[PDB]
Amino acid sequence: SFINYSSREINCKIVYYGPGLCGKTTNLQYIYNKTAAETKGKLISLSTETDRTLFFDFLPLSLGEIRGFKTRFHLYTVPGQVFYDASRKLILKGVDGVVFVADSQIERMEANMESLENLRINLAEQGYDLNKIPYVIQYNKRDLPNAVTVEEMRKALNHRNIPEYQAVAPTGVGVFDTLKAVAKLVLTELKKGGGSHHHHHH
Ligand SMILES: Nc1nc2c(ncn2[C@@H]2O[C@H](COP(=O)(O)OP(=O)(O)O)[C@@H](O)[C@H]2O)c(=O)[nH]1
Numbered sequence: 001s002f003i004n005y006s007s008r009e010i011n012c013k014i015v016y017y018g019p020g021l022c023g024k025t026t027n028l029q030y031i032y033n034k035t036a037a038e039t040k041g042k043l044i045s046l047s048t049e050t051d052r053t054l055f056f057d058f059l060p061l062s063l064g065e066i067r068g069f070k071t072r073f074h075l076y077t078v079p080g081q082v083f084y085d086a087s088r089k090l091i092l093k094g095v096d097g098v099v100f101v102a103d104s105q106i107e108r109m110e111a112n113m114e115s116l117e118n119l120r121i122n123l124a125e126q127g128y129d130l131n132k133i134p135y136v137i138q139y140n141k142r143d144l145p146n147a148v149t150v151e152e153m154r155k156a157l158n159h160r161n162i163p164e165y166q167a168v169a170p171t172g173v174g175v176f177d178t179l180k181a182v183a184k185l186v187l188t189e190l191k192k193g194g195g196s197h198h199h200h201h202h
Contacts, residue, residue, distance in 0.1 A: 001096050001190070009059070009072045012186050013094050014179070016077040017119050018101035019111035023140040024077040025054060026169035027101060031075065031179060032056055034172070051087040054079050066190055073183060089122045097134035097182040098123075101167075102157055104139050104147035109156055116157055134185035136163040138178045143168045 002011040016024040032043050040058035057074040078091050092098075100119060102112045120130045139153045150166065158164055163181045167174030189195060 002094070003069065008069050010066065010069045010190060011057070011072050011074060012096040012183075012190075013074050013076060014097045014099065014182055014186070015091055015095045016075065016099045016101055017088070017091075017115065019103060019108060019115040020079075020081045022101045022103035022108065022112070022115075023138075023167070023169040024101050025079040027099070027138070027140075027167075027175055027178070028054055028056070028075055028077060030169060030172050030175045034176070036061065050083040052079060053077070053087075053091065063187075066187070071187065071190070075179075085118070085122075088118060089125065092119075092122055092126060092128070095123070095128065095133065097186045098130070098136075099178055099182050100135070100137045100157075101140050101169075102137060102153060104141045104153060105144055106146050106148050109148065109152075112157055131160065134182050134189060136165065136178055136182045136185070138165045138167045138174060140167045140169050140174075142166045142173070143171075 001013070004011060016027055018024055029043070032040065035058050039061060041056055043056045044054070046053045053076065055074060055076040057072055059070060059072045063071055076091055078087050082088060098119065100116060123130050137158055139150060141147055150164070154164065165174045165178040165181065167178060169175055
């Protein structure tokens with residue numbers, strides 16, 4: 001988190017991760033369109049010649065303060081086909097919570113498994129353990145006839161009873177349930193004072 005004492009805001013970074021075309025943009029856009037205009041920034045896309053980043057922030061009005069501070073959530077993803085692994089490494093810098101979005105189609109199951117391993121390795125390369133940070137998994141595209149059962153999704157992707165949410169992102173099914181779950185894990189960590197605290201005088 002980035003705790004800005006001037007604004008009295010705790011800024012938490014939630015990264016949506018998963019294979020290309022699995023539904024990350026759709027999650028972010030659905031959330032963005034169902035967030036109060038007065039609470040949110042612009043929806044921002046940063047494009048290079050190849051890879052892109054999509055993100056926005058918002059300050060939910062329902063949330064109480066944590067020891068005098070409000071919590072602002074920043075949602076980040078690298079959407080679409082990824083050309084540089086470095087892009088997925090960079091998106092994880094400063095992460096506070098992760099949503100892994102799995103594409104439930106059988107044809108994408110190997111891509112899901114590769115992306116989940118890539119997430120664990122890229123986190124570890126920057127000193128994060130996926131087992132020690134707020135993390136939820138979304139089984140997206142439940143509407144498609146080639147979507148594998150939750151049982152098969154879990155056998156392939158979830159061996160630690162990670163909180164799991166079924167989603168159909170374009171219609172919003174499961175989208176807020178997923179976000180609420182990871183946000184609650186992040187907030188619980190903040191309230192208990194868990195994690196490593198660094199004091200900067202910049
Ligand atoms: N049928 C179906 N299509 C989906 C679902 N979620 C995303 N899509 C479609 O899959 C494509 C890729 O989604 P997108 O969110 O851009 O993927 P990203 O690369 O992970 O950001 C788009 O055409 C979406 O409309 C879903 O739950 N069901």
